[PDB]
Design a protein around this nucleic acid. Sequence first.
RNA 1: GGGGCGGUAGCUCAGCCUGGGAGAGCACCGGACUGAAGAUCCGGGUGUCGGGGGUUCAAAUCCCCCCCGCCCCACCA
RNA 2: AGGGGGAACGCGGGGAAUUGAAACAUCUUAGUACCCGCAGGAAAAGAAAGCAAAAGCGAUGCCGUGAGUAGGGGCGAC
RNA 3: GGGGACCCUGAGUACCGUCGGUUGGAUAUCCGGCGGGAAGCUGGGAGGCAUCGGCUCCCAACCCUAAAUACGUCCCGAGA
RNA 4: GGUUGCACCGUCCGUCUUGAAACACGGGGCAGGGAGUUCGCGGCCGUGGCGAGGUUAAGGGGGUUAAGCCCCGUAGCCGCAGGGAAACCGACAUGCCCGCAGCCGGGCCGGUGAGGGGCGGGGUGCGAAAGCGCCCGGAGUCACGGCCGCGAGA
RNA 5: CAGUUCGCUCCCGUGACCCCGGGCUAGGGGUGAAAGGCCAAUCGAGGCCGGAGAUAGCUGGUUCCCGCCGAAUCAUCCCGCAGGAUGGCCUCCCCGGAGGUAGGCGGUGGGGUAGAGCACUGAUUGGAGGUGCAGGGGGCGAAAGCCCCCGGCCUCCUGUCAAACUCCGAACCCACCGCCGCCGUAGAUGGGGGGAGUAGGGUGGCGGUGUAAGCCGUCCACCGAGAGGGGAACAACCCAG
RNA 6: CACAGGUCCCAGCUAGCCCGAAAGGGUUUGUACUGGGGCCGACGCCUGCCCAGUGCCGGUAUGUGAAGCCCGGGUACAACCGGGUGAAGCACCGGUAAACGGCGGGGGUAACUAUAACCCUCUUAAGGUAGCGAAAUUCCUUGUCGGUUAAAUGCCGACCU
RNA 7: GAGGCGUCGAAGCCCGGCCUCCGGGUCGGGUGGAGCCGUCCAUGAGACACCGCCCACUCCCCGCUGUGUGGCUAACCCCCGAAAGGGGGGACAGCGGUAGGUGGGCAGUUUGGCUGGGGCGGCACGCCUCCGAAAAGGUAUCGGAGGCGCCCUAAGGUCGGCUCAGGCGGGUCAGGAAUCCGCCGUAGAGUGCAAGGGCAAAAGCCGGCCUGACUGGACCCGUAACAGAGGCGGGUCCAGCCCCGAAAGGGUGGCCUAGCGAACCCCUGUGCCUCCCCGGUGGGGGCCAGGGAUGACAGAAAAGCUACCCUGGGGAUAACAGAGUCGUCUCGGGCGAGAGCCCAUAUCGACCCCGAGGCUUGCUACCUCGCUGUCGGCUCUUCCCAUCCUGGCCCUGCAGCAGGGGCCAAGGGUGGGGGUGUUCACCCAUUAAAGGGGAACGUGAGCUGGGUUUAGACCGUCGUGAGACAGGUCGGAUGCUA
Lengths: 94, 239
Amino acid sequence: MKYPKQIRTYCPFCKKHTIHKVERVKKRPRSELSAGQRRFRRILKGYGGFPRPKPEGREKPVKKLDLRFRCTECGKAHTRGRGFRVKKFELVEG
Amino acid sequence: MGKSLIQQRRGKGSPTFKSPSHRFRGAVKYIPLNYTQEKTLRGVVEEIMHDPGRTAPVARVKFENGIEKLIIAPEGLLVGQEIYIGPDAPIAVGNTLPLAKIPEGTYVYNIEGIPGDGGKYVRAGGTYALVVSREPDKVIVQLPSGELKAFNPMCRATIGVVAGGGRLEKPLVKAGKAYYKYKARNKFWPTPRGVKMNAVNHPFGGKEHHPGKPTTTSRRAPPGRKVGHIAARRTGRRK
RNA sequence: GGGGCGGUAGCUCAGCCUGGGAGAGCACCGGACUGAAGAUCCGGGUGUCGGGGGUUCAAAUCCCCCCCGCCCCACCA
RNA sequence: AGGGGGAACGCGGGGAAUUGAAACAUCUUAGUACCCGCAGGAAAAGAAAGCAAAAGCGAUGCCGUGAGUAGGGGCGAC
RNA sequence: GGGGACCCUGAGUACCGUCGGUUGGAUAUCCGGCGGGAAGCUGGGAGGCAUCGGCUCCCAACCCUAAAUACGUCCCGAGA
RNA sequence: GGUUGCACCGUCCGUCUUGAAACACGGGGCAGGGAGUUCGCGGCCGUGGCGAGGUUAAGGGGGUUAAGCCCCGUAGCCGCAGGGAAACCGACAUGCCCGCAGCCGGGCCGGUGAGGGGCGGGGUGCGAAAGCGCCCGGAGUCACGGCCGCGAGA
RNA sequence: CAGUUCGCUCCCGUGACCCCGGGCUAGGGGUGAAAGGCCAAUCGAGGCCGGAGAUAGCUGGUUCCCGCCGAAUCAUCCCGCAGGAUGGCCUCCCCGGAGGUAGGCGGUGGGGUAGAGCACUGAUUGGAGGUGCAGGGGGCGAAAGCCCCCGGCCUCCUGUCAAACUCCGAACCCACCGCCGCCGUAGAUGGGGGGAGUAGGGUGGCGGUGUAAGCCGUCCACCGAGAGGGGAACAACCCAG
RNA sequence: CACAGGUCCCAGCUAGCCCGAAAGGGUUUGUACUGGGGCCGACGCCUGCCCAGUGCCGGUAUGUGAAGCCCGGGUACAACCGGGUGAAGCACCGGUAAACGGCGGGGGUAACUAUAACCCUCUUAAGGUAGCGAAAUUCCUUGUCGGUUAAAUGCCGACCU
RNA sequence: GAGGCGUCGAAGCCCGGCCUCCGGGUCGGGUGGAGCCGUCCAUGAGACACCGCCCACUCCCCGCUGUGUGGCUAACCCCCGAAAGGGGGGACAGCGGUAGGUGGGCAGUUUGGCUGGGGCGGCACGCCUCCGAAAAGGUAUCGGAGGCGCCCUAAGGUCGGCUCAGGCGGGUCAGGAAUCCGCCGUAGAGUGCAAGGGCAAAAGCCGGCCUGACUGGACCCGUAACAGAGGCGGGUCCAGCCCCGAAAGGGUGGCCUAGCGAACCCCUGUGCCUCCCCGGUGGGGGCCAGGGAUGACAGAAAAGCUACCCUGGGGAUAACAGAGUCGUCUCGGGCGAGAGCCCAUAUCGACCCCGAGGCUUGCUACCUCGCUGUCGGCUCUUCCCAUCCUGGCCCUGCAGCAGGGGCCAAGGGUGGGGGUGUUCACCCAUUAAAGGGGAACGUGAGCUGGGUUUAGACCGUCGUGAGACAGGUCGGAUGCUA
């Protein structure tokens, strides 16, 4: 669960191992914005298909872990392959 | 699901739920063709008749324009009475004048709702309204309900009580005699109970005894759901 | 995951914009009192006041990071 | 100066459902069936605030082609 | 045929806002209802998002229109 | 050929069913009626034409009583280059080794071996890089008939 | 006799009575003294025509002969189970091409079922001898006191036997190589294409469950789709294709 | 089933309620002694208790609450993004059962022969009250006891958990 | 910024309004008539020295703007009327457009599969392990045992040193443990967690260092044996970057096997590609990879009733009966514990063991769903004996009278009443005795139709409700000419 605040691991950008700083992946709202949003303009009377939101859970105790690992040497984030399922993640010092 | 119910049929004009209008011979107007004001008009009690359609006493009055129209009879009436209309009518039992000329504390009937339409309130047999308070702004009258309504003093009304009473609601005695009243009116009778009429016919009941939904119903509910206690604020009388 | 409100002395909390060592009652303990039954007095303190840091002259509450409870909302980015 | 009729066709409105999706509601059936008004021997469209291969053209129908192509759609069937 | 000031030269329109219907019509179909609302060819519109610029074409808010295209009542001719 | 005796054998028919002579279902008897059709598209196949090209549709001219056949029309489609989301880039008219058919030489064997199989190199996409994907040493096009799917009332 | 009849019996017979003629109320609507009853031999929602040859995984049926090859009723998924699709499998055609190994033997590999046993992991039956000890009884009492004793708690040579135990373990199955046999160039061995079908039964062996019959695995001659002779007859028992 | 009788409910008429696509129409030649809707079913005696839940109704400080409108950011314009304003509605408060409905469990304990009048406890708001009952629905069961009957799984009477 | 302001008239004296934490400041009248200050710098933070803009609570004129409310009528509208006009109300409202709330009033639908028929219950519906599994492999059941949908950032990585529960004796303590000393000890220890297998210079134990639980692209197998079959998982490579180690060499997380999820859609990280005559900008679209659900688990969007029902089918499947079957039931035989004063058998008879029958109950799903109509009674008849009586016989704890027990035997007989619909069962008095069982649970093309029992109804229980009942109850067609 605990993971260090800074930790040395591989950076593809600079193509070398270096220290990365951890924060959480942050995701956008809707309501402009997208081609899927424009798909929800057929909910005028579109009660059966896609824009009615197909009303059903079931909806899963877990999530996986998704955690930006941020480069110090160029300031660009990366997200990558992980599989740490977590229900009580804590970020701590390091 | 279910179909139109008992009230919903009435509004349609259905013939089981329509009044006869040819054994009826009623209505009362004070002649609004000459407005509320004007003394121009007097009449003579021509007869005291039975009106068949209101099952009530009525008086026939013969005007000096030469027109025959009914005025709702007072108590103590006797043929050959003079009824006068206009503000120049004396304040007397069975005479008709505007509210302003009428003093407070006196029994009154046949008051106009809106000035010049010959009455819209208090036209029932044996029932009478009492003039409690009077202001030249607005004249407050106490209704058969007990509710004080404000009226404009240009409205016409007549002094006295209305004749009869104890004869527009007295014991029905038996089914035969009760039946004779419903031909004189229009009410759907005999009518069974909803509780063991099906849940197709009526929202409540089944085949067995048991209700289906509670009697007192929302006021904002649609038509065809006004059953039970309709627009009730409270129910029952004991704990 | 977003918003708001309450977690304070053993308990429930007041002030939170009204800032400091600073609160209040009620349990509980001690004392009168009583043949008994019964009622009523008189004392005592337990939280810089949920955690950790900063601005401030002396801030619990302001700021920055939050645990716990509750109400209204939210998977595939 | 008119009603009304006329074999279908034509113009303008109103406008389903069984069915398909192995069920079912968007979608599909279909702008179909069905209904109302109305004209003719064709009807209607029709002499440019058009096209847009930026180049080339200058009223309008229809047939062949462009093509099951662009695009739509439980992105499922269609 | 050439000479000066070029002429409101068509309004609830153009276009925008809200909601639908409809179509392949996708940000960019077409039309309707409700609300707002222009300009004067010196101007406006269009070329499949918005806006501003270049370039090109083109004038809505007036009307009609022959000929080539649909039918099957009818007549004749014909049959893997 | 009609009918019949003897010896021997022999529990209909069709359907349903794991099993039917059936106490499973259906039939009185005879005659007539009585059920795999058309269109589009896709995938197969056989034949036939032409060939790195092939094939014309609509139409009018033409011919004929009409019409078909005959000629014109190449609009347009497909193949001759593929990869890639697109930007955009772009290849072997076979170099090496086996071996069937066949040919040749010897007396089953030893060559030569199209087709074919097995390598190498190349084109493109992803890619720091490496590694994989697809493609590459000229055959298609149209016609006829038939087989089958799916869409249609099928 | 009658798509509601006949006889007898019964209820009502001045009444909320019966009865005629005209008119009125029409389909999720009426009408109903309330049965989901009735609304023209049709009502838990009338008839008619159009949409329309609605749809079915569901029943029945689908017509001339002959020749050749000749099944599967298993496997995965599915709002799927009395249904489809995709294999395995069946047939027809085409392509490449020389071995193939169902058979049997030896060599080189794999193995715990029958059987068998105490050597473990293991559950437990029984008496001895220890008196090693937690303790319920007694004694020099100081009620198990130093010390011995008796339910007894657990050693020890012994004592019952073990799908999920083993100090062990056949017959037998199967992989591979060589040989031999047989098969093959009228094309085997393998590939691609087109067209399908996709309820099983059954004796025995080895089983698992369940008193059993029945159900379900596995291999199987066979019936299914295969006659004939024998078993009195007797789908699958025998002989025989 | 109807029924006379009983109860509860709403509405001042430019009403309530309801019909109609619209134009309009019923109740209504009506006016609270009216007429509309449920619930119960002559007469006699009565109708206990509970609003915790569900329904209805009134009110609602505080909280929340859409679009329209407004402000700030964005955009050369527009999309867009942020905040306030945020009604009915909901949380919330009260009332209301002849509105729907609900009307209970365990131990211990009395001379003694029994049993438990008696006392504890708790879910959830209340804990069955006037009555009646081995019911036309006391399971078990053909209870038990009696009447009638030589004999009665019946009937009727009684006890009645 | 340590100084600035004034004789246009200032402190400082005298009062008025004044607020307050009575700290001290503001302020109108006047006497006045020319200073008061800060510096020193006390003060956490410094100057009404002077000059600027400001932050608290808050108040007021003026300019702009909403809403709320009251008056007006000019729109507009409701009332009356034959009109004319009056009456009432009034920008409320009526009407058009739009948004939220409510909304079985109405309509279209759905509510799964598995299964000893259905349904409860359970789920063996996804996945892991031993055994079942027949000594290679595949291998089923609502077959046994028993688990996973997480936990750990050390419970990971690498290297060096080191080897264990447990027992034995000695010390310490209340025995004991941690802890100490020696001896024994091939694995019984430990490895997070089911189970199994693996392992002792280790994967067990310790110390130090370290964060590869890494990026990218393959390969292979399971998944799904052979043999099709997605997704997903692991192992194994190489390339790149690190880590540790003396290096060799190891590390694609946790010794291995459970701890996971499509099509689509969205968002993140990063760069580029692209967006309709053309550019700039805004805003879009796209390639890749990562993350997000379908748990009914190769993935619909979902609650009930039908005895008012309808149709297609099905004997692949329930009710009656039969067949099969025989646990259950009925009955028998063998052995003889035991009491009967004594004496097992005059009589009674346990424990246990073995058969027979089809008569109770149940299992079977074979036969029928284009019907093989149920039970009881009635009437009418056949057969069987393990025989109630009559006949003939034997014993006795047989005195007689009278019992008890045993053997042969279906020829004949074996009744009437009271309750129940009742087969059966209970009861009365008679009788020589008042026997049982099979025959479509004999007997409905013979009767009856009382009971099972449909469409009507009430009550109890339960349910929001429709509606249900092996609860009670009333009433509810018996066709046909052989």
